[PDB]
Design a protein around this ligand. Structure first.
Ligand SMILES: *[C@@H]1O[C@H](CO)[C@@H](O[C@@H]2O[C@H](CO)[C@@H](O[C@@H]3O[C@H](CO[C@H]4O[C@H](CO)[C@@H](O)[C@H](O[C@H]5O[C@H](CO)[C@@H](O)[C@H](O)[C@@H]5O[C@H]5O[C@H](CO)[C@@H](O)[C@H](O)[C@@H]5O)[C@@H]4O)[C@@H](O)[C@H](O[C@H]4O[C@H](CO)[C@@H](O)[C@H](O)[C@@H]4O[C@H]4O[C@H](CO)[C@@H](O)[C@H](O)[C@@H]4O)[C@@H]3O)[C@H](O)[C@H]2NC(C)=O)[C@H](O)[C@H]1NC(C)=O
Ligand code: YP5
Ligand code: CA
Ligand code: CA
Ligand code: K
Ligand code: NA
Ligand code: ZN
Length: 799
């Protein structure tokens, strides 16, 4: 019904309900615009710039923008009007001056926010393209910037734009790729075409909805591709000239560049200079335009990308047809990641186990690795959605995976792509904030794009919907409007058991070959006399209802679960000077009852003997005991945890070699280790009724993962246990697997593969918090916002 009119309706904010014709910034994309949309709304006459001869002209409403006297009040001047016609300077030529307070026109209730989003803008463009992007360089140097911003996985456009909008992981917002099949709708989502416009795909609450629901007006964020950039900018500036009761407070611009060119020419192709220049010119138009409206010291501006761009060519393609004989029985979502499902749900002869094995470590330099999705690095948060296929391929940077060669030459063309692991340097993107609410000439550490939703809410005075950001962790970007969170309340208080059981009350099937001056000595140790050394940041708080005990020892402190029959956490400090020792021969198979903990709340050695697949390890490593006498404590049944022999190779090397290495490199480290149970791969602590595996014959639950949090002084001239200032952390969440199939070199010595495994499984403290229902760093001398920043830190081990 496109015989309605867009007269006086151009770029209307409220989308009219068809079958009435549309005049909003998306109507082109649904082929739904009124007949006169182009004529009235996409004027082009005379181009985009005032010239000296158009100054003071009589208004001609055919023109794309105006150079008449009345244009400022009307809000439709070309962005260079005051420069060309009133001898003003371009914004970029003006010195930076601190913006201490919003300098807004009367009637503005809050500083507007404008998000300037750029597709495929790789983080290193800020330095490498700086000579050709002066407007962007001024935003960056005068505002608040990060060296880079980490996207989410997969590092594709729609997952990342919707993460920016919602503060959610793709698994939670449901946009898990640029292409998807949802088995409960039995429907497909694609970039091309129209099913993606169906609202059932899009979960959580995006910023524009959050705004609307709380009485803040929002501009429409999505722009049809054919609307020229100049027109997008002029539309924003027109909206900003609306009356107070109609004018939005939040706007987004989007550019398809430099992504579009990057795919064709590679991230640093010589052809990339012009797209970067053109983007910079658009930023300049916006800023000149704000300046003429007296809004350039009023508005907060965010310059942000969705992902970066890597060099990728046709010839760097792995073909599943080279591995699988059965290739026509699978559907592959291809490219910079792979997702595999059965071609037909009626094929009972499909077996994911046999596909995985056919794809595992088959060629010496194989450029992808298969995973069941629950085994992917937990830092990716890429499993808890039915739209994510069980079988996943993590593709090496610079490579593609495809089903058959004909897929790649029956479509070389492209030189750039993205989608890879979000740790990869080429995938990193940008963040700049400029305005009254951002800090002045401030650099901040790199951070994840899941955090920005909360900040954008802070900037608009909105209460954010529940999301995966850690609200407060980006307070250091802001001059004001910080969010002041309180530490969560401890839900369960610990018991502190003393000696309550005699040795002969235990029938655990365990065995161990085991003065009065230092008899008091060991009593004080068991009462917590060394605890200030081994528990540096306070005990972790337990944020759920459970029954647990604090157990003190010479070398380590633990919070021992009576429910899970093992520690939730074990804490210990290893100085620079500490010595590694062996497990003495007499103690090789030693497990000792803990006379503080009932036999009924203890593990037993007979279960491990019976269970031919499962062995055990220790959370506090016997190798790092302070003394031969202290070493007995490490063999308590309360320090034992279930470990597959294959995993013990990993764990033993970490404990015997790597902990001491870190303590030497970082001037002591504090370590907190423990189990994780996430059988439903939702990234959250399992309740006891969610556990799918026990040690045979017992109530001993088997962890899905083992974590460690390794903390030291950021100023490494100070020892970990005597640190005056900011901390440094690195953490991991290691999968507890019965094989080392993940590691193709695992036949080799652990010095050749364990550390690279651990790096792959690097984690944020926050990730561990979700997975354990523990809250760490409760008792430091640092600000809580600083600790939140520390908890979101990821050590990426990239160059
Ligand atoms: C990252 O941040 C997010 C947001 O904070 C965290 O996700 C939240 O996690 C909560 C715990 O898992 C979860 O709470 C559940 O909500 C159920 C109600 O859900 C609807 O309502 C909300 C609010 O409007 C809405 O956001 C939800 O949106 C999801 O689902 C739609 C599909 O309809 C999607 O479009 C959208 O993308 C989103 O999908 C994601 O979440 C769902 C899970 O809800 C996943 O399945 C998807 O894969 C995807 O990840 C919904 O529209 C509520 O019913 C649940 O309550 C049950 O569960 C517990 C016990 O298990 C119990 O206390 C209750 O009694 C109840 O049990 C009964 O029902 C069970 C389930 O059917 C049944 O098995 C039992 O037998 C019982 O009878 C639950 O409270 C919250 O929804 C999501 N929110 C979002 C946005 O994802 C996420 O955890 C964070 N991640 C990390 C790692 O920290
Ligand atoms: C066929 C196609 O039509 C699909 C293609 C590839 C991406 N795109 C778009 O249409 C496209 C158009 N507008 C926006 N705006 C973005 C959305 C968003 C989310 C959060 C934030 Cl904070 C800011 C923004 C501005 N994003 C995307 C071409
Ligand atoms: Ca993109
Ligand atoms: Ca779980
Ligand atoms: K065993
Ligand atoms: Na292996
Ligand atoms: Zn792209």
């Amino acid at each position: 019904a496109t015989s309605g009119s867009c007269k006086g309706r151009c770029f209307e904010l409220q989308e009219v309900g068809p079958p009435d014709c549309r005049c909003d910034n998306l109507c082109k994309s649904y082929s739904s615009c009124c007949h006169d949309f182009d004529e009235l709304c996409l004027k082009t006459a005379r181009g985009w710039e005032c010239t000296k001869d158009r100054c003071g002209e009589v208004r001609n409403e055919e023109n794309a923008c105006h150079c008449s006297e009345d244009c400022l009040s009307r809000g439709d001047c070309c962005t260079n009007y005051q420069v060309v016609c009133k001898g003003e300077s371009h914004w970029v030529d003006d010195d930076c001056e601190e913006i201490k307070v919003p300098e807004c026109p009367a009637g503005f209730v809050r500083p507007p926010l404008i998000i300037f989003s750029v597709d495929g803008f790789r983080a290193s463009y800020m330095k490498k393209g700086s000579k050709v992007m002066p407007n962007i360089e001024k935003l960056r140097s005068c505002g608040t910037h990060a060296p880079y911003m980490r996207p989410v996985y997969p590092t594709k456009t729609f997952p990342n734009l919707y993460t920016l909008a919602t503060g959610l992981y793709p698994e939670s917002h449901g946009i898990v790729g640029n292409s998807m099949y949802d088995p409960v709708f039995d429907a497909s989502f694609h970039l091309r075409g129209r099913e993606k416009f169906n609202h059932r795909w899009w979960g959580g609450q995006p910023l524009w909805i959050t705004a609307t629901k709380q009485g803040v007006r929002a501009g429409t964020f999505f722009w049809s591709v054919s609307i020229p950039h100049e027109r997008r900018i002029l539309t924003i500036l027109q909206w900003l000239s609306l009356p107070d009761n109609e004018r939005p407070s939040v706007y987004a611009f989007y550019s398809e560049q430099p992504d579009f060119s990057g795919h064709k020419y590679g991230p640093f192709g010589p052809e990339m200079t012009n797209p970067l220049r053109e983007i910079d010119k658009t930023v300049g138009q916006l800023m000149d335009g704000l300046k003429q409206l007296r809004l350039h010291r009023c508005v907060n501006v965010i310059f942000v990308g969705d992902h970066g761009m890597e060099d990728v060519t046709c010839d760097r393609t792995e073909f599943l047809s080279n591995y699988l004989t059965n290739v026509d029985d699978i559907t592959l979502v291809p490219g910079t990641l792979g997702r595999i499902r059965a071609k037909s749900i009626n094929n009972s002869k499909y077996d994911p186990k046999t596909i995985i094995a056919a794809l595992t470590c088959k060629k010496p330099d194989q450029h992808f690795k298969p995973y069941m999705k629950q085994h992917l690095p937990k830092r990716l948060h890429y499993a808890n959605n039915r739209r994510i296929e069980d079988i996943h391929l993590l593709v090496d940077r610079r490579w593609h995976v495809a089903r058959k060669p004909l897929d790649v030459y029956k479509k070389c063309f492209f030189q750039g792509d993205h989608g890879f692991d979000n740790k990869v340097n080429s995938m990193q993107t940008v963040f700049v904030g400029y305005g009254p609410t951002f800090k002045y000439r401030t650099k901040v550490p790199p951070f994840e794009n899941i955090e920005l939703y909360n900040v954008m809410c802070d900037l608009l005075g909105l209460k954010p919907a529940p999301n995966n950001g850690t609200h407060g962790s980006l307070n250091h970007l802001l001059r004001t409007n910080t969010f002041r969170p309180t530490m969560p309340d401890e839900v369960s208080r610990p018991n502190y058991p003393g000696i309550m059981y005699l040795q002969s009350e235990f029938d655990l099937g365990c065995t161990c070959d085991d003065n009065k001056l230092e008899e008091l000595n060991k009593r004080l140790h068991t009462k917590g006399s060394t605890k200030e050394r081994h528990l540096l940041y306070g005990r972790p708080a337990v944020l759920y209802r459970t029954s647990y005990d604090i157990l003190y020892h010479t070398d380590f402190e633990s919070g021992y679960s009576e429910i899970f029959l093992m520690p939730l956490w074990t804490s210990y400090t290893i100085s620079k000077q500490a010595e590694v020792s062996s497990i003495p021969e007499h103690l090789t198979n030693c497990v000792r009852p803990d006379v503080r903990v009932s036999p009924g709340f203890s593990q037993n050695c007979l279960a491990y003997k019976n269970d031919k697949q499962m062995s055990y390890g220790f959370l506090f490593p016997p190798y790092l005991s302070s003394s031969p006498e202290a070493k007995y404590d490490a063999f308590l049944v309360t320090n034992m945890v279930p470990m597959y022999p294959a995993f013990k190779r990993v764990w033993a090397y970490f404990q015997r070699v790597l902990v001491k290495k870190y303590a030497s490199e970082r001037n002591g480290v504090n370590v907190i280790s423990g189990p994780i149970f996430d059988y439903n791969y939702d990234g959250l602590r399992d309740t006891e009724d969610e556990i799918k595996q026990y040690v045979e014959g017992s109530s001993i639950p088997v962890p899905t993962h083992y974590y460690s949090i390794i903390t030291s002084c950021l100023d490494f001239t100070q020892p970990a246990d005597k640190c005056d200032g900011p901390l440094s952390v690195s953490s991991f969440i290691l999968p507890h697997r019965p094989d080392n199939d993940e590691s193709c070199n695992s036949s080799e010595d652990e010095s050749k593969w364990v550390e690279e495994l651990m790096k792959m499984h690097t984690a944020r403290v926050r990730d561990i918090e979700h997975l354990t229902g523990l809250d760490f760093y409760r008792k430091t001398s640092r600000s809580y916002s600083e600790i939140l920043t520390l908890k979101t830190y990821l050590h990426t081990y990239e160059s």
